[PDB]
Design a protein around this ligand. Structure first.
Ligand SMILES: CCCCCCCCCCCCCCCCCC(=O)OCC(COC(=O)CCCCCCCCCCCCCCCCC)OC(=O)CCCCCCCCCCCCCCCCC
Ligand code: HEA
Ligand code: HEA
Ligand SMILES: CCCCC/C=C/C/C=C/C/C=C/C/C=C/CCCC(=O)O[C@H](COC(=O)CCCCCCCCCCCCCCCCC)COP(=O)(O)OCCN
Ligand SMILES: CCCCC/C=C/C/C=C/C/C=C/C/C=C\CCCC(=O)O[C@H](COC(=O)CCCCCCCCCCCCCCCCC)COP(=O)(O)OCCN
Ligand SMILES: CCCCC/C=C\C/C=C/C/C=C\C/C=C\CCCC(=O)O[C@H](COC(=O)CCCCCCCCCCCCCCCCC)COP(=O)(O)OCCN
Ligand SMILES: CCCCCC/C=C/CCCCCCCCCC(=O)O[C@H](COC(=O)CCCCCCCCCCCCCCC)COP(=O)(O)OC[C@@H](O)CO
Ligand SMILES: CCCCCC/C=C\CCCCCCCCCC(=O)O[C@H](COC(=O)CCCCCCCCCCCCCCC)COP(=O)(O)OC[C@@H](O)CO
Ligand SMILES: CCCCCC/C=C\CCCCCCCCCC(=O)O[C@H](COC(=O)CCCCCCCCCCCCCCC)COP(=O)(O)OC[C@@H](O)CO
Ligand SMILES: CCCCCCCCCCO[C@@H]1O[C@H](CO)[C@@H](O[C@H]2O[C@H](CO)[C@@H](O)[C@H](O)[C@H]2O)[C@H](O)[C@H]1O
Ligand SMILES: CCCCCCCCCCO[C@@H]1O[C@H](CO)[C@@H](O[C@H]2O[C@H](CO)[C@@H](O)[C@H](O)[C@H]2O)[C@H](O)[C@H]1O
Ligand SMILES: C[C@H](CCC(=O)O)[C@H]1CC[C@H]2[C@@H]3[C@H](O)C[C@@H]4C[C@H](O)CC[C@]4(C)[C@H]3C[C@H](O)[C@]12C
Ligand SMILES: C[C@H](CCC(=O)O)[C@H]1CC[C@H]2[C@@H]3[C@H](O)C[C@@H]4C[C@H](O)CC[C@]4(C)[C@H]3C[C@H](O)[C@]12C
Ligand code: CUA
Ligand SMILES: [Cu+2]
Ligand SMILES: [Mg+2]
Ligand code: NA
Ligand SMILES: [O-]
Ligand SMILES: [Zn+2]
Lengths: 43, 227, 84, 514, 98, 79, 259, 58, 46
């Protein structure tokens, strides 16, 4: 395929943030729940 | 039972299960061969700069790759069906035993002569004895005479369960309102384990099956002692 | 089969109206006669509390939860028998 | 305007887009469930400490992956986008009914998550066999909500099937015979026929489960003369067609992807490929009882179903060999999509061959309700339906968005997923031959090595799913607009540009008869 | 025995249905219901491709029974050729608004 | 007069995995034979073979339920 | 400005109100069965009927009034309706399978016989036979109505169609009666189960089909149909034959052979 | 009755850019508002009821 | 008429890649978290 160069280029810094933020949106909430499992059972 | 890092089938306890292993080796050679041939040929197609992008004639070659696969299926079906009908073949059992599935344990009935029946529950992990197996041991084993044709009748008094003993090649669903026949013949004495093979609620993972295979005289004296 | 009548030249409304009033409605009228003849009530049978009948695994979501939707006191017993 | 366009759509591309969005969200729900599963099995013992909760996780995992991720993406998504464009049709035949097929799915899903939030959920398996699914063993609303979820998903797919069949039959250029329609369109029409015939039998079964639970019927209850095996027959009568429904559009997309990235004007053996997909559709209706080899059925029946199941290998073989034949002498572009498609050909083959092992009723006695079945079907849904969805998505994202993906990030995503799924599912074969039951929350101790490896692999695939989200964000974040697409002469869906306009083929194509 | 009271397409058909119906009475196909008949499609005898714009997608079934359709845009101006078989096609713009 | 009974033998009327009818038949046959005799004076003994087969094959809980229902008047089969 | 014959439909809210009505009826049945309340059901049923009305109304507007129904659009709707009816045959097939399964291998709980011990079946020669006569008659009367319309005959179409509906309603009142009078219930084991659920779904389809015919009757009154364009009428006629043939199968199977 | 189809064809073909579900006039609007209100209100009462049934109430 | 072309044939804005990141994060995030909070919810019920 061929394409125009990016209209709004996304630098390494910017990708690092988007990837970091993406991963954390998945991991924090699951991690919170799995970490508090004992607290849910003893209750 | 299974042992750690086991790859294949539990060792054959009956001659029926002996036949399944040799049929499995057969079928698996064929699987490996085809799987390897597909993997190889993909890589053959993908490893040349040489091109032929024009229209290719499909008649001659479609013959080859329907007839060949069709022959392979027959090479598999033949012994598959030999074994199916051999399994079914009439046996003349010396003995009938019923098993009723329950939430969440097996009940057993030996009622040819006397009214012998007991409940069989998993040994809790906190109550295991030195060298006993987690999730597999039962309070009351199914004692059965070795080297003799036994008829198992399987059923349930609540939900579906299924009565399995992988070493003997056995799995018969346990359905209320229904009595499923199967036949059992251990070539050897010992302990032969199995697990409820139809989801039946909370404790489906925790209602196992232990067969204890001993000589007839020990079986007779056991039975008398269990009344 | 040809059934046994005749017909079948061109296919008009006229033919199908012929069959509507010549065969169809007369058949309905005969079966209506034949029915308003073998009707009137019948010997309601001795109640036996067979376990394969009057099934109750969950109360019905209407009434007292023990009557079926088209309950007829005359011919439908409850699991404990017919009603006074 | 936003409402008139996205809640009131009658446009095949916008509805295809709502489907892909819905599918992608469902995929996340489906994935979380699969990680809870593999968390519980990741070391010996109990994690959730409640094997009804485990049973509910497994049930919902399957409902979500099957009914809310695969079908809506493949048929609702790629189907509404591509089928009209590939036959130069101005939209689908019933473009307003098409919108209701889509809006039935959010309600269907709300019913499933309600099922899991009320009482103790439905710990039944996706098969929902009675009497466990019954009003004694599963008292209360959970199973009824599950039944009603399946009813709405059912109506959605039946109306969709009528829509694709009508559209593909009636809305081709007048000069295009069905033997000039591309293979993806064929895959969807044959899929739609399967959906038309099979779902109404499921609706019957689960409606009879609804009356046993709530109106004192006894269809499946021995006390009233009923039979639980009846429900199995009705469910599997649908359930086998269902699995071919899950893969046929997959086959369609694989055929286009392999053709395109081989730099070929056509797939090898077009008519053979049509024949194969139709044979597979037909045979898929006369094999259902291979799901029932252990319920206690007569030897002759078990020999028929063994034999009828194996036949399917032949037509399926003609597709596999025809894809190798398409590659042969190709000018191969090692694009991300081609990688997915080459992954597909290999893993699907592996999965189908373990299927052929299960076809032998004899062996199936030992393998049934073990992890050997779980391994078989994850090789053909989580390396088959999923790999064909990925290949299609990276291949057609530019058409749908106007934007291009980073090809390097996408090859990286492929590499991570391939290791993930192979580490997750290959060992389950061993767990199966050695006799580990399925629908188990804990296992005897000998099973720990392969369960640990399997659970670790489940995590490597989570990492790919997370990267995927980032990759789609990067594409939209960077905004690299498409210019040129090769092979438009044999890929009509690209020929109106990227994205194509809201209205396409306002002027139909011109095709001579000669 | 009989009578009337039931309108005809000629009396009561309207909008695009009426337009399709009246065009077919004159043997015209403005709404692309019929497959065009090919010419020999040479330079001298090109395939005449009606359009309401200055481009329209052709699809060429190069030979009878071919399953592969070759798709390309035809622009107003000099006769273009099918990239697979070379048969010529010419755009003949403008129409509709009658 | 085979007696020397170990278990119910193969009955060619019931050759497949589902043995429900086999149990049921032998239960009916016994209580039938038992009624013939406990009416016309003779010896339950001639009914014995039906008794041993149904006892061998039938779940305790089925027999138990069938017996309770004979007593109740709700037994659905014909004796 | 299109130069194809097919119908681009205006943005519609009815697909959304349809889907939500589906959620309201299913969650309302759940509310009814389990939490002893009918209000969700009452609302879903209402919005469903409101949806149905406005959607099919719009189809009339689009066709009779705006003329978007070219021969191509009509050919499509034909396929659509044939495909819908096929889907309904497979639904019923599920219940025939159920019936044949239960009745061909009666279980011990039933006395090992069909009919089950304690089931006193309806005489297939009484109201069942009348019902058969009524649906077959309606099959004749709707065919006369079809030929009347094709031949331009307004009065005779309306007469034939009125008759077809009357017979439709007659069947419905008869079935309501024999439901009331039946000595067995839906809870009389698998006999009651198969009987009331199979014939009860049939009964619903008779009402749906009757409703469709009535819509066709009123549209004909307002002169919507021409002698050559009347797909609403053919669809209703196809549906009505379907309902008729399903009844013949129920009669032969449940009422006659199952007696 | 008389054949007033031609009247209706004029009304529904009037070039006012109104969609087909609103083109009949003010009652189309009223009926739509009642339909959409029952649907959206019913769906919120639905979400409340799932709320209710999600937590134990002896 | 509606808007056509890149970033305009979708029901979400791509005008700002950070606003977009928030939306994608909420959307795939609500999906993945939902099961964890259902397990939680059932563990707490008893
Ligand atoms: C994941 C961990 C692997 C564990 C291995 C254990 C070894 C230690 C004991 C070291 C050895 C100890 C000796 C004990 C002998 C016991 C014999 C027995 O009981 O006999 C039964 C055994 C016989 O099986 C075996 O003989 C082992 C299977 C190996 C197959 C070839 C793969 C080799 C590569 C390994 C990487 C796997 C992951 C990727 C595999 C990719 C998917 C197939 O168990 C089976 O029946 C397995 C059934 C698998 C069915 C799938 C068929 C598809 C195959 C496709 C191959 C693609 C080519 C690779 C191409 C590879 C490129 C990617
Ligand atoms: C399509 C169907 C599908 C998919 C994709 C999956 C995916 C996975 N499944 Fe699934 N599974 C089933 C269908 C599927 N499964 C069924 C039907 C059962 C049986 C249920 C029962 O017994 O009742 C089951 C059972 C099952 C068990 C057995 C439970 C038990 O017996 O106790 C396990 C255990 O490992 C498991 C694991 C996994 C894992 C790790 C993944 C995945 O994590 C592997 C990696 C794949 C992904 C993460 C895919 C992500 C795709 C997307 C997100 C789409 C993105 C969208 C766009 C680009 C538009 N599955
Ligand atoms: C897309 C989904 C999909 C597909 C395509 C298939 C394809 C096949 N399946 Fe599978 N299957 C499932 C999804 C699928 N399956 C699921 C979800 C279950 C269980 C669900 C549950 O219980 O919850 C299941 C269960 C299942 C069982 C029951 C096991 C048990 O529960 O005990 C069996 C038994 O025969 C089976 C067989 C097959 C066969 C023979 C094929 C064939 O169609 C495969 C044919 C393909 C090949 C053979 C490879 C390509 C061919 C060649 C390279 C040519 C040469 C080949 C030969 C010579 C053989 N499947
Ligand atoms: C368990 C029991 C075991 C038994 C064994 C069972 C065996 C079953 C066998 C089935 C036979 C199948 C064969 C397949 C083919 C059959 C014939 C092909 C028909 C066909 O294709 O022919 C065409 C169509 O005809 C058509 O539909 C047909 C047109 C018919 C018109 C001629 C009929 C005239 C005779 C009298 C008509 C009946 C009376 C009507 C009123 C009755 C009221 C009650 C040609 O039409 P035509 O001739 O120009 O005129 C048409 C009439 N207008
Ligand atoms: C509690 C149960 C109640 C049941 C309820 C349901 C019933 C369904 C019926 C619906 C009511 C509709 C009836 C219509 C009646 C009259 C219509 C008026 C028109 C008329 O009188 O029709 C005439 C013929 O019909 C006529 O005699 C009409 C003939 C009527 C037929 C009735 C059958 C009479 C039976 C007696 C004889 C039986 C013998 C049959 C045996 C042989 C069969 C093989 C012809 O008209 P015309 O000359 O072409 O018109 C001139 C221009 N249009
Ligand atoms: C002449 C027929 C008139 C029909 C209109 C009257 C009533 C409403 C029901 C109609 C819907 C039809 C089928 C639904 C299922 C079962 C009903 C069977 C028909 C019926 O009405 O049967 C009655 C049972 O009523 C009962 O419980 C039924 C109580 C009502 C239950 C509501 C329905 C719940 C089930 C809905 C499932 C829908 C799934 C469809 C799937 C769509 C496709 C994907 C019989 O009465 P009885 O007192 O047992 O015996 C008579 C004794 N004197
Ligand atoms: C107490 C009463 C309770 C009633 C509520 C229960 C439900 C009732 C449903 C009744 C069905 C009504 C259907 C009305 C359809 C009217 C619209 C119509 O008929 O539309 C026609 C096309 O048909 C079309 O779209 C095709 C129309 C397809 C509709 C198919 C309907 C059957 C399916 C209904 C739902 C089944 C549910 C099954 C449950 C298990 C319009 O084209 P023509 O007629 O050619 O006219 C144009 C000419 O005038 C030109 O000169
Ligand atoms: C337990 C409770 C479960 C409840 C679930 C109920 C589910 C949904 C709620 C019902 C909402 C339905 C509202 C009316 C829908 C009418 C559809 C219709 O009439 O669809 C037509 C197409 O299908 C055709 O013909 C023929 C097809 C007509 C389909 C009729 C829709 C009824 C759906 C019933 C279920 C179907 C499956 C039954 C088999 C098991 C018209 O196509 P459109 O794209 O609109 O217009 C195109 C234009 O060219 C017309 O001018
Ligand atoms: C159409 C032609 C296809 C040709 C293939 C055959 C298909 C169907 C017809 C066959 C039905 C009768 C078969 C006769 C053989 C035996 C019947 C029998 O008895 O079958 C019973 C149930 O059949 C039952 O209801 C079976 C109920 C029917 C299920 C059939 C499934 C197919 C349905 C889909 C077809 C699409 C329909 C399209 C609409 C026209 C099974 O119980 P047994 O195992 O006896 O248990 C007793 C034990 O004590 C013995 O050990
Ligand atoms: C299968 C999908 C899941 C994959 C694995 C996800 C693991 C990623 C970790 C992200 O999770 C965080 O871990 C923290 C700890 O590392 C938790 O804090 C907990 O522990 C801290 C100290 O140890 C305290 O400060 C906090 O209050 C307490 O909530 C926190 O809630 C959780 O978000
Ligand atoms: C996605 C949708 C999923 C839907 C899930 C299905 C659940 C539908 C159930 C409807 O719930 C209702 O809520 C009422 C209140 O609004 C309850 O009042 C009940 O609660 C209290 C009893 O303590 C008191 O208010 C009353 O006496 C008593 O009737 C009532 O019983 C219950 O039926
Ligand atoms: C005749 C038909 C269509 C040919 C055409 O119209 O183009 C073709 C298409 C696919 C062909 C089949 C497929 O190639 C699969 C089979 C291949 C074997 O070589 C012959 C039988 C076989 C079953 C073929 C018979 C016949 O040649 C088929 C059915
Ligand atoms: C009103 C109309 C006459 C004028 C016109 O054609 O519009 C006539 C034609 C056919 C008549 C109908 C048909 O004769 C069928 C029915 C006959 C009943 O005797 C009265 C109601 C009945 C439903 C009639 C009502 C009305 O008189 C109709 C509808
Ligand atoms: Cu008992 Cu699983
Ligand atoms: Cu299958
Ligand atoms: Mg099983
Ligand atoms: Na565990
Ligand atoms: O399968
Ligand atoms: Zn050409």
């Amino acid at each position: 395929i061929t394409a125009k160069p990016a209209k709004t280029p996304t630098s390494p810094k910017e990708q690092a943030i988007g990837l970091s933020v993406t991963f954390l949106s998945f991991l924090l909430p699951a991690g919170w729940v799995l970490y508090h499992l004992d607290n849910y059972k003893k209750s | 039972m299974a042992y750690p890092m086991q790859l294949g089938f539990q060792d054959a306890t009956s001659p029926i299960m002996e036949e399944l292993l040799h049929f499995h080796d057969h079928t698996l050679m064929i699987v490996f061969l085809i799987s390897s041939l597909v993997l190889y040929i993909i890589s053959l197609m993908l490893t040349t700069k040489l091109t032929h992008t024009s229209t290719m004639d499909a008649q001659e070659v479609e013959t080859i790759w329907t007839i060949l696969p069709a022959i392979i299926l027959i090479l598999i079906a033949l012994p598959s069906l030999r074994i199916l009908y051999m399994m079914d073949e009439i046996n003349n059992p010396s003995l009938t035993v019923k098993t009723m599935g329950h939430q969440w344990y097996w009940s057993y009935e030996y009622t040819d002569y006397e009214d012998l029946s007991f409940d069989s529950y998993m040994i809790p992990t906190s109550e295991l004895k030195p060298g006993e197996l987690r999730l597999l041991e039962v309070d009351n084993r199914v004692v059965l005479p070795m080297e003799m044709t036994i008829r198992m009748l399987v059923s349930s008094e609540d939900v579906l369960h299924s009565w399995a003993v992988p070493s003997l090649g056995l799995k018969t669903d346990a359905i209320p309102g229904r009595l499923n026949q199967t036949t059992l013949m251990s070539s050897r004495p010992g302990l032969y384990y199995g697990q409820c093979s139809e989801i039946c609620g909370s404790n489906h993972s925790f209602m196992p099956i232990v067969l204890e295979l001993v000589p007839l005289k020990y079986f007779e004296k056991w039975s008398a002692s269990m009344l | 089969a040809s059934a046994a009548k005749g017909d079948h030249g061109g296919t008009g409304a006229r033919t199908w109206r012929f069959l509507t009033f010549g065969l169809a409605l007369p058949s309905v009228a005969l079966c209506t006669l034949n029915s308003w003849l073998h009707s009137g009530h019948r010997e309601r049978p001795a109640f036996i509390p067979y376990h394969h009948l009057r099934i109750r695994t969950k109360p019905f979501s209407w009434g007292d939860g023990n009557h079926t939707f088209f309950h007829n006191p005359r011919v439908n017993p409850l699991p404990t028998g017919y009603e006074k | 305007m936003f409402i008139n366009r996205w809640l009131f759509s009658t446009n095949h591309k916008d509805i295809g887009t709502l489907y892909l969005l819905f599918g992608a969200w469902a995929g996340m729900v489906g994935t979380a469930l699969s990680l809870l599963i593999r968390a519980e099995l990741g070391q010996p013992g109990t994690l959730l400490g409640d094997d009804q909760i485990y049973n509910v996780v497994v049930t919902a995992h399957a409902f979500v992956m099957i009914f809310f991720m695969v079908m809506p993406i493949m048929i609702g998504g790629f189907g509404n986008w591509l089928v009209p464009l590939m036959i130069g049709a101005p939209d689908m035949a019933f473009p307003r009914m098409n919108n209701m097929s889509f809006w039935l799915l959010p309600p269907s899903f709300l019913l499933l998550l309600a099922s899991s939030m009320v009482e103790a959920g439905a710990g039944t398996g996706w098969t929902v066999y009675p009497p466990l699914a019954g009003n004694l063993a599963h008292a209360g609303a959970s199973v009824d909500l599950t039944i009603f979820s399946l009813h709405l998903a059912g109506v959605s797919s039946i109306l969709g099937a009528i829509n694709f069949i009508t559209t593909i039959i009636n809305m081709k250029p007048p000069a295009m015979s069905q033997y000039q329609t591309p293979l993806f369109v064929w895959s969807v029409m044959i899929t739609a026929v399967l959906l038309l015939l099979s779902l109404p039998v499921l609706a019957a079964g689960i409606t009879m489960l609804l009356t046993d639970r709530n109106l004192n019927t006894t269809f499946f209850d021995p006390a009233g003369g009923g039979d639980p095996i009846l429900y199995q027959h009705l469910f599997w009568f649908f359930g086998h067609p269902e699995v071919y429904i899950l893969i046929l559009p997959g086959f369609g997309m694989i055929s286009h992807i392999v053709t395109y990235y081989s730099g070929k004007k056509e797939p090898f053996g077009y008519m053979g490929m049509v024949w194969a997909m139709m044979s597979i559709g037909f045979l898929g209706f006369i094999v259902w009882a291979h799901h029932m080899f252990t319920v206690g059925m007569d030897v002759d029946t078990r020999a028929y179903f063994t034999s009828a199941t194996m036949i399917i290998a032949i037509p399926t073989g003609v597709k596999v060999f025809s894809w190798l034949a398409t590659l042969h002498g190709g000018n191969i572009k090692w694009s991300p999509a081609m990688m997915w498609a080459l992954g597909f050909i290999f893993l699907f083959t592996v999965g189908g061959l373990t299927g052929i092992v299960l076809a032998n009723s004899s062996l199936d006695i030992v393998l049934h309700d073990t992890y050997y079945v779980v391994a078989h079907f994850h090789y053909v849904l989580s390396m088959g339906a999923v790999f064909a969805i990925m290949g299609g998505f990276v291949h057609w994202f530019p058409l749908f968005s106007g934007y291009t993906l980073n090809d390097t990030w996408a090859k990286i995503h492929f590499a991570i997923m391939f290791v993930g799924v192979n580490m997750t599912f290959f060992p389950q074969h061993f767990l199966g031959l050695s006799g580990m039951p399925r629908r188990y929350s804990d296992y005897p101790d000998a099973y720990t090595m392969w369960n640990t490896i399997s659970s670790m692999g489940s995590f490597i695939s989570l990492t790919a799913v997370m990267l995927m989200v980032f990759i789609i964000w990067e594409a939209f974040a960077s905004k690299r607009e498409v210019l040129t697409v090769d092979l438009t002469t044999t890929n009509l869906e690209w020929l109106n540009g990227c994205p194509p306009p809201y209205h396409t083929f306002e002027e139909p194509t011109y095709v001579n008869l000669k | 025995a009989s009578g009337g009271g039931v309108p005809t397409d000629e009396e009561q058909a309207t909008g695009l249905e009426r337009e399709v119906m009246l065009a077919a009475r004159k043997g015209q196909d403005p709404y692309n219901i019929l497959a065009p008949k090919a010419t020999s499609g040479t330079k001298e005898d090109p395939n005449l491709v009606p359009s309401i714009t200055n481009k329209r997608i052709v699809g060429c079934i190069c030979e009878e029974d071919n399953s592969t359709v070759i798709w390309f845009w035809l622009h107003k101006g000099e006769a273009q050729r099918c990239p697979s078989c070379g048969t010529h096609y010419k755009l003949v713009p403008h129409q509709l608004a009658h | 007069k085979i007696k020397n009974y170990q278990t119910a033998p193969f009955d060619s009327r019931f050759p497949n995995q589902n043995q429900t009818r086999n149990c049921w038949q032998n239960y009916l046959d016994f209580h039938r034979c038992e009624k013939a005799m406990t009416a016309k004076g003779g010896d339950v003994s001639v009914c014995e073979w039906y008794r041993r087969v149904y006892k061998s094959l039938c779940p305790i809980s089925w027999v138990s339920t069938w017996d309770d229902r004979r007593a109740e008047g709700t037994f659905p089969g014909k004796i | 400005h299109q130069t194809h014959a097919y119908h681009m439909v205006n943005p519609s809210p009815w697909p959304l109100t349809g889907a939500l009505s589906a959620l309201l009826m299913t969650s309302g049945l759940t509310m009814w069965f389990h939490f002893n309340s009918m209000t969700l059901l009452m609302i879903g049923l209402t919005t469903n009927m409101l949806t149905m009305y406005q959607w099919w109304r719009d189809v009339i507007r689009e066709s009779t009034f705006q003329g978007h129904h070219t021969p191509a659009v009509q050919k499509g709707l034909r396929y659509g309706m044939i495909l819908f009816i096929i889907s309904e045959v497979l639904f019923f097939t599920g219940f025939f399978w159920a019936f044949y399964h239960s009745s061909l291998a009666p279980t011990p709980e039933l006395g090992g016989c069909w009919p089950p011990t304690g089931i006193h079946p309806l005489n297939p020669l009484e109201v069942p036979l009348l019902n058969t006569s009524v649906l077959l008659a309606s099959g004749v009367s709707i065919t006369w109505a079809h030929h009347s319309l094709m031949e331009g005959d307004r009065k005779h179409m309306l007469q034939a169609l009125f008759i077809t509906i009357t017979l439709g309603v007659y069947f419905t009142l008869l079935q309501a009666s024999e439901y009331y009078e039946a000595p067995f219930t839906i809870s009389d084991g698998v006999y009651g189960s198969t009987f009331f659920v199979a014939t009860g779904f049939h009964g619903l389809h008779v009402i749906i089909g009757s409703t469709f015919l009535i819509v066709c009757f009123f549209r004909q009154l307002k002169f919507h149909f021409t002698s050559n364009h009347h797909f609403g009428f053919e669809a209703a006629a196809w549906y009505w034959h379907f309902v008729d043939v399903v009844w013949l199968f129920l009669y032969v199977s449940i009422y006659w052979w199952g007696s | 009755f008389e054949n007033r189809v031609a009247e209706k064809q004029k009304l529904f073909q009037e070039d006012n850019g109104l969609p087909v579900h609103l083109k009949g006039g003010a009652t189309d609007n009223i009926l739509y508002r009642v339909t959409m209100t029952l649907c959206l209100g019913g769906t919120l009462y639905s979400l409340y009821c799932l709320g209710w049934a999600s937590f134990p109430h002896k | 008429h509606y808007e056509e072309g890149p970033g305009k044939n979708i029901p979400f804005s791509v005008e700002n890649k950070w606003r977009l990141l928030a939306m994608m994060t909420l959307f795939f995030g609500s999906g993945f978290a939902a099961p964890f909070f259902i397990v939680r919810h059932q563990l707490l019920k008893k």
